[PDB]
Scaffold this active site. Structure first.
Site, mmCIF file in Angstrom:
data_model
loop_
_atom_site.group_PDB
_atom_site.id
_atom_site.type_symbol
_atom_site.label_atom_id
_atom_site.label_comp_id
_atom_site.label_asym_id
_atom_site.label_seq_id
_atom_site.Cartn_x
_atom_site.Cartn_y
_atom_site.Cartn_z
ATOM 1 N N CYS A 1 -6.144 3.708 2.111
ATOM 2 C CA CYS A 1 -5.374 4.869 2.920
ATOM 3 C C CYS A 1 -4.580 4.526 4.028
ATOM 4 O O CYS A 1 -5.054 3.795 4.883
ATOM 5 C CB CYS A 1 -6.358 6.046 2.890
ATOM 6 S SG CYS A 1 -5.652 7.650 3.854
ATOM 7 N N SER B 1 -4.600 6.069 6.821
ATOM 8 C CA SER B 1 -5.427 6.474 7.777
ATOM 9 C C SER B 1 -6.306 5.042 8.170
ATOM 10 O O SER B 1 -6.735 4.885 9.395
ATOM 11 C CB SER B 1 -6.281 7.612 7.648
ATOM 12 O OG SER B 1 -5.621 8.730 7.492
ATOM 13 N N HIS C 1 -4.256 2.986 10.213
ATOM 14 C CA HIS C 1 -4.009 3.612 11.497
ATOM 15 C C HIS C 1 -5.101 2.958 12.576
ATOM 16 O O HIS C 1 -5.133 2.768 13.577
ATOM 17 C CB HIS C 1 -4.167 4.967 11.537
ATOM 18 C CG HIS C 1 -2.897 5.757 10.991
ATOM 19 N ND1 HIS C 1 -1.679 5.090 10.938
ATOM 20 C CD2 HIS C 1 -3.016 7.005 10.408
ATOM 21 C CE1 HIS C 1 -0.999 6.157 10.472
ATOM 22 N NE2 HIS C 1 -1.694 6.998 10.183
ATOM 23 N N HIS D 1 -12.748 4.876 3.714
ATOM 24 C CA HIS D 1 -13.159 6.172 3.735
ATOM 25 C C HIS D 1 -12.941 6.790 2.237
ATOM 26 O O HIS D 1 -13.384 8.158 1.955
ATOM 27 C CB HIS D 1 -12.648 6.999 4.567
ATOM 28 C CG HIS D 1 -11.053 6.943 4.700
ATOM 29 N ND1 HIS D 1 -10.269 6.387 5.033
ATOM 30 C CD2 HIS D 1 -10.532 8.238 4.365
ATOM 31 C CE1 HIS D 1 -9.184 6.728 5.235
ATOM 32 N NE2 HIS D 1 -9.227 7.815 4.485
ATOM 33 N N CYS E 1 -10.189 10.818 -0.730
ATOM 34 C CA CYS E 1 -9.236 11.051 0.338
ATOM 35 C C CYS E 1 -7.915 11.483 -0.089
ATOM 36 O O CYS E 1 -7.607 12.562 -0.059
ATOM 37 C CB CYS E 1 -9.112 10.069 1.449
ATOM 38 S SG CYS E 1 -7.906 10.790 2.419
HETATM 39 N N1 NAJ Z 1 -5.096 15.244 6.884
HETATM 40 C C1 NAJ Z 1 -5.820 14.353 6.164
HETATM 41 O O1 NAJ Z 1 -6.926 14.743 5.739
HETATM 42 C C2 NAJ Z 1 -5.348 13.228 5.682
HETATM 43 C C3 NAJ Z 1 -5.704 12.536 4.721
HETATM 44 C C4 NAJ Z 1 -5.202 11.477 4.202
HETATM 45 C C5 NAJ Z 1 -3.947 10.637 4.841
HETATM 46 N N2 NAJ Z 1 -3.759 11.348 5.990
HETATM 47 C C6 NAJ Z 1 -2.414 10.865 6.790
HETATM 48 O O2 NAJ Z 1 -1.157 11.374 5.903
HETATM 49 C C7 NAJ Z 1 -0.133 10.218 6.194
HETATM 50 C C8 NAJ Z 1 0.234 9.453 4.806
HETATM 51 O O3 NAJ Z 1 -0.827 8.926 4.397
HETATM 52 P P1 NAJ Z 1 -0.661 8.048 2.900
HETATM 53 O O4 NAJ Z 1 0.094 8.905 2.072
HETATM 54 O O5 NAJ Z 1 -1.543 7.264 2.816
HETATM 55 O O6 NAJ Z 1 0.520 7.016 3.781
HETATM 56 P P2 NAJ Z 1 1.785 5.946 3.032
HETATM 57 O O7 NAJ Z 1 1.589 5.709 1.580
HETATM 58 O O8 NAJ Z 1 2.125 5.064 4.107
HETATM 59 O O9 NAJ Z 1 3.059 7.041 3.101
HETATM 60 C C9 NAJ Z 1 4.032 7.513 4.112
HETATM 61 C C10 NAJ Z 1 5.317 7.776 3.727
HETATM 62 O O10 NAJ Z 1 5.878 8.100 4.754
HETATM 63 C C11 NAJ Z 1 7.343 7.423 4.778
HETATM 64 N N3 NAJ Z 1 8.010 7.660 6.102
HETATM 65 C C12 NAJ Z 1 7.807 6.891 7.183
HETATM 66 N N4 NAJ Z 1 8.651 7.322 8.211
HETATM 67 C C13 NAJ Z 1 9.429 8.503 7.492
HETATM 68 C C14 NAJ Z 1 10.481 9.357 8.444
HETATM 69 N N5 NAJ Z 1 10.859 8.898 9.557
HETATM 70 N N6 NAJ Z 1 10.752 10.056 7.418
HETATM 71 C C15 NAJ Z 1 10.436 10.416 6.466
HETATM 72 N N7 NAJ Z 1 9.623 9.470 5.594
HETATM 73 C C16 NAJ Z 1 8.912 8.395 6.379
HETATM 74 C C17 NAJ Z 1 7.008 6.193 4.292
HETATM 75 O O11 NAJ Z 1 8.266 5.486 3.853
HETATM 76 C C18 NAJ Z 1 5.976 6.317 3.224
HETATM 77 O O12 NAJ Z 1 6.354 6.605 1.901
HETATM 78 C C19 NAJ Z 1 -0.833 9.303 7.250
HETATM 79 O O13 NAJ Z 1 -0.592 9.665 8.568
HETATM 80 C C20 NAJ Z 1 -2.189 9.411 7.087
HETATM 81 O O14 NAJ Z 1 -3.058 8.880 8.197
HETATM 82 C C21 NAJ Z 1 -4.050 12.496 6.373
HETATM 83 O O1 PFB Z 2 -7.017 9.901 5.890
HETATM 84 C C1 PFB Z 2 -8.188 10.816 6.314
HETATM 85 C C2 PFB Z 2 -8.161 10.813 7.789
HETATM 86 C C3 PFB Z 2 -7.860 11.747 8.547
HETATM 87 F F1 PFB Z 2 -6.923 12.837 8.135
HETATM 88 C C4 PFB Z 2 -7.827 11.608 10.124
HETATM 89 F F2 PFB Z 2 -7.436 12.603 10.769
HETATM 90 C C5 PFB Z 2 -8.672 10.620 10.678
HETATM 91 F F3 PFB Z 2 -8.829 10.690 11.927
HETATM 92 C C6 PFB Z 2 -9.122 9.602 9.686
HETATM 93 F F4 PFB Z 2 -9.693 8.602 10.276
HETATM 94 C C7 PFB Z 2 -9.017 9.624 8.236
HETATM 95 F F5 PFB Z 2 -9.223 8.750 7.582
HETATM 96 ZN ZN ZN Z 3 -7.374 8.860 4.103
#
Ligand code: NAJ
Ligand code: PFB
Ligand code: ZN
Ligand code: NAJ
Ligand code: PFB
Ligand code: ZN
Ligand code: ZN
Ligand code: ZN
Lengths: 374, 374
Positions: free
Chosen positions: A46, A48, A51, A67, A174
């Site tokens: 993921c 995250s 990150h 996770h 996730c």
């Molecule tokens: N809220 C939650 O529970 C939760 C769960 C899982 C993931 N996340 C977060 O969600 C985000 C996406 O996760 P993911 O899908 O695994 O990531 P990912 O696979 O890296 O996808 C992110 C996408 O964003 C695109 N991108 C980057 N910059 C820009 C921009 N400026 N404009 C438009 N598109 C852009 C990029 O090209 C990529 O396809 C990350 O920040 C994670 O940490 C949060």
């Molecule tokens: O991808 C899920 C995810 C989150 F949405 C967070 F806000 C975070 F802090 C983290 F560690 C995480 F794994």
């Molecule tokens: Zn996640």
């Protein structure tokens, strides 16, 4: 036999930020009261987890991250009632204690026993079950799935269908659940509506899946990587736009495309600028925008509150708003009943030993989800 | 005797920011097609009118302000169907055209014909009905109620009960409806919940009324003027807090008092800092915060989006979320049936000619609503 004994196994230890994972032998203590030791089968990569590597998320190091996963219970501590040795399980990075004011609330899921807000990097008891080269190693979100074996608190694990394909249903730990729930539960996308989804990775594709399941008429994918557009359309995007192709800010483009603003927008990237753009592009009087992405630690956004005064709703959520232990088994049952697909999210399947190569695929833009197999 | 004729009458003209209103003769043109000329009977002093004077709210000057009022139709233009001469009416500062995508939406009220987002200070046709000293004078929000006579577009007026007491029900034209609807319609306050209301003026008192009507168990008023607390308790506050009494930030105080955050908070002041404080003090997983206060022109707030990612909902609204022309007559009928009280909001009554004294009372902190009689 391993029950009641320390296990020596392989794990991916992150010793410091901005370095590769170290694949090496760790010691995993047996589970204490109300703890569960799991033999991992599959874990997803993921953003995250990345990150933690990049310093976008601050968590105690050294750490065993991971996770999004699924495995099989190896042993249980005293007092565990919800899983048994041999059960298929998904670790829950958002726990469900069942007892806190959030768990008791009909619409809360961010259980107060979580280790996200103010991460300790421990078990619920404030101790670690991991050592490596004689040093204690932190947990991550109570899950630590980048290891052949982990120990989790009972409130951080769900029992799932014994016939589950763990190399697919790990995504319910996730990315799938988060994106799908962000659309169907948090936003409550309506039939016939127009949605904009910022970020077309595994989580954004799951948002699209949810918007399509909810009956949206138009689902506009937004990504700076046009290589993401074909799969977004396969799972339900009706249009895709690349901000880099336009002279205007993309909020103006999306407002024009939607004849005055979208019904629902989603930030699924993790940038402050895209969170404000996503809010702005929803219709000013009745639009809803949901923050899903995770931005850099301790950074504030700037916005004009007139965006809200006109009537917009701005919300965010962890794990799609799902109460984790109630929801994960039902999502797996729904997957087994063919109610949604997971294969569109899986671009790469690698052995666990290739974790670094899986992170490089994510960072390069190539992959959606890489599943690591133990 | 005046139908089709210019009317010379007294109005309160604002020639310059930060100056008293000038009570002087204006010329009020007769209504054109789909316009309504109203003999004003009563108008309230709302803090938003004072925002015009202070430059908190930017609208073209010189201007006839006033937006919270009631009167009697003097004449109708060609094609008007919804009011007649002699009807009691409330001008609608948020129009209801009935035709735009917002008016058609079940939850929209911020009609696209509004003059609030980017004020022109005109009628719908881009012209003014007011002259003073031979100079054209701007309208305000399509209403301009600080005048013995005004002209409004038909979509900006509602017919109300012929037996209405206009010196009371003018408050349905802004402050009561805004506060009450912010609680019952926008937030959807629940039975047994804990609410926090920032700002205990006419609008915040109306928010308390709505929270009490919705069955909240605890309603915490917040104001830096402790002289506001007695009336807040009279209309339903269970306790009041003055941030100036505490060493810690009031969001921390309110989180402590509510054993982990409130269910619903309301910003009813107009400060960027209290908008962020109000969001912060609602429970992080399931809390809802509503922005009601008007922010200073063109200024952005700064906030950490982690406040939303945990599960909070942040929204705002104009006029309590009420579709104005549908809702205002129903609210008057409910007032007539004693379903809510307006007298708690009315602290002072003055003749229109004493408008400047009425603003002095608001600025000093003394008044809630002063009602001006023509
Ligand atoms: N809220 C939650 O529970 C939760 C769960 C899982 C993931 N996340 C977060 O969600 C985000 C996406 O996760 P993911 O899908 O695994 O990531 P990912 O696979 O890296 O996808 C992110 C996408 O964003 C695109 N991108 C980057 N910059 C820009 C921009 N400026 N404009 C438009 N598109 C852009 C990029 O090209 C990529 O396809 C990350 O920040 C994670 O940490 C949060
Ligand atoms: O991808 C899920 C995810 C989150 F949405 C967070 F806000 C975070 F802090 C983290 F560690 C995480 F794994
Ligand atoms: Zn996640
Ligand atoms: N959204 C809408 O449709 C709408 C409608 C009507 C009014 N408004 C706005 O709502 C706000 C309140 O209007 P009103 O009730 O007529 O004004 P008001 O009578 O001036 O009440 C504001 C209250 O805020 C208090 N206050 C000032 N600063 C602080 C502080 N730092 N902390 C706590 N309390 C403080 C103050 O003492 C007063 O009692 C103004 O900004 C209006 O412009 C918005
Ligand atoms: O008090 C109601 C009211 C508002 F809520 C505004 F946002 C505004 F701009 C204004 F002029 C006004 F009168
Ligand atoms: Zn809990
Ligand atoms: Zn309209
Ligand atoms: Zn007002």
């Amino acid at each position: 036999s391993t029950a009641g004994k320390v296990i020596k196994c392989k794990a991916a230890v992150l010793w410091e930020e901005k370095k590769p994972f170290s694949i090496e032998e760790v010691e995993v203590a047996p589970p204490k009261a109300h703890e569960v030791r799991i033999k991992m089968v599959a874990t997803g990569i993921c953003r995250s987890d990345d990150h933690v590597v990049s310093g976008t998320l601050v968590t105690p190091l050294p750490v065993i991250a991971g996770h999004e996963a699924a495995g099989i219970v190896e042993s249980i501590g005293e007092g565990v009632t919800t899983v048994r040795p041999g059960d298929k399980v998904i670790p829950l990075f958002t726990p469900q204690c069942g007892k806190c004011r959030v768990c008791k609330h009909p619409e809360g899921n961010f259980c107060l026993k979580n280790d996200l807000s103010m991460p300790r990097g421990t078990m619920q008891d404030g101790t670690s079950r991991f050592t490596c080269r004689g040093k204690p190693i932190h947990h991550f979100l109570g899950t630590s799935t980048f290891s052949q074996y982990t120990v989790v608190d009972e409130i951080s694990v769900a029992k799932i269908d014994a016939a589950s394909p763990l190399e697919k249903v790990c995504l319910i730990g996730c990315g799938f659940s988060t994106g799908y729930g962000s659309a169907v539960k948090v936003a409550k996308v309506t039939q016939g509506s127009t949605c904009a989804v910022f970020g077309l990775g595994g989580v954004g594709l799951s948002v699209i899946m949810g918007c399509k399941a909810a009956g949206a008429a138009r689902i506009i994918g937004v990504d700076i990587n046009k290589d993401k557009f074909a799969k977004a359309k396969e799972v339900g995007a009706t249009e895709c736009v690349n901000p880099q192709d336009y002279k205007k800010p993309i909020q103006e483009v999306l407002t024009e495309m939607s004849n005055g603003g979208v019904d629902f927008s989603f930030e699924v990237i993790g940038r402050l600028d895209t969170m404000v753009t996503a809010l702005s592009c929803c219709q000013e009087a009745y639009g809803v925008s949901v923050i899903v992405g995770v931005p850099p630690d301790s950074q504030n956004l700037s916005m004009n509150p007139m965006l809200l005064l006109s009537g917009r709703t701005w919300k965010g959520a962890i794990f799609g708003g799902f109460k984790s232990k109630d929801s994960v088994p039902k999502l797996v049952a729904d997957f087994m009943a063919k109610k949604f697909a997971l294969d569109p999210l899986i671009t790469h399947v690698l052995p666990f030993e290739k974790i670094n190569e899986g992170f490089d695929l994510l960072r390069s833009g190539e992959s959606i989800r890489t599943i690591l197999t133990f």
